[PDB]
Design a protein around this ligand. Structure first.
Ligand SMILES: N=C(N)c1ccc(/C=N/OCC(=O)O)cc1
Ligand SMILES: [Ca+2]
Length: 223
């Protein structure tokens, strides 16, 4: 997260870190057994880390649970990043409490102008590289589809939206991938892609979760 703020320990209780010996992606806990992330975060041997603030220090509220299975969206295209969404099932159910909590799926899509909270342990620099150890947060508006398409000609599908600031300076970044965009207590987006980070006229692009609710529910119901 570039140009954000320190969230505060366990203030974003649905935020997970995906770990394969090291943090590599974010995710969002959607019930005691399931995490939503980006398909481009797919790999084998994932351990889901819940209740994290400092990802490098055991602070007392963590739950580390290995993934039993991952399900990449059936129509995920890694070239275009269309349908950049994946479900991860935990080998055992997380213990839910104030600091480890699921986030609601949307019942309707959010609109341009809605303010959302974007979070992660990604790069905090728009030119250099600096990885924070504690969770970072950014409040950002969803942008209009027209401005999103104008920013990224020929690249924005109906399964994507832009959020952030056309002026630059405030954005998600590398390492935030798969993490949440939450708007009025609903998971509306997943950190997917963008040109660099926090660049002028290059806002963050996010997987449009409201498109996938049917698939998420049906998948969970049978796996
Ligand atoms: N909002 C952005 N500008 C943005 C967001 C996410 C990415 C994803 N990079 O994938 C590599 C990785 O996470 O390891 C790029 C740009
Ligand atoms: Ca920790």
């Amino acid at each position: 997260i570039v140009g954000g703020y320190t969230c505060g320990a366990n203030t974003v209780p649905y935020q997970v870190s995906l770990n394969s010996g090291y943090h590599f992606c974010g995710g969002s806990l959607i019930n005691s057994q399931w995490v939503v992330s980006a398909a481009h975060c797919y790999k084998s041997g994932i351990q889901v880390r819940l209740g994290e603030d400092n990802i490098n220090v055991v602070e007392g509220n963590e739950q580390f649970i290995s993934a039993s299975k991952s399900i990449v969206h059936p129509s995920y295209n890694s070239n275009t990043l269309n349908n950049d969404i994946m479900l991860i099932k935990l080998k055992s159910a997380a213990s839910l409490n104030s600091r480890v909590a699921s986030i609601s799926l949307p019942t309707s899509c959010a609109s341009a102008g809605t303010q959302c909270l974007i979070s992660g342990w990604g790069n905090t620099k728009s030119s250099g590289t600096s990885y924070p150890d504690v969770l970072k947060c950014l409040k950002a508006p969803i942008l209009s589809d027209s401005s999103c398409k104008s920013a990224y000609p020929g690249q924005i599908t109906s399964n994507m939206f832009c959020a952030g600031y056309l002026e630059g300076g405030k954005d998600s970044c590398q390492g935030d991938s798969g993490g949440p965009v939450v708007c009025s207590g609903k998971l509306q987006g997943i950190v997917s892609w963008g040109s660099g980070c926090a660049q002028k006229n290059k806002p963050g692009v996010y997987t449009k979760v409201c498109n996938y609710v049917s698939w998420i529910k049906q998948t969970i119901a049978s796996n």
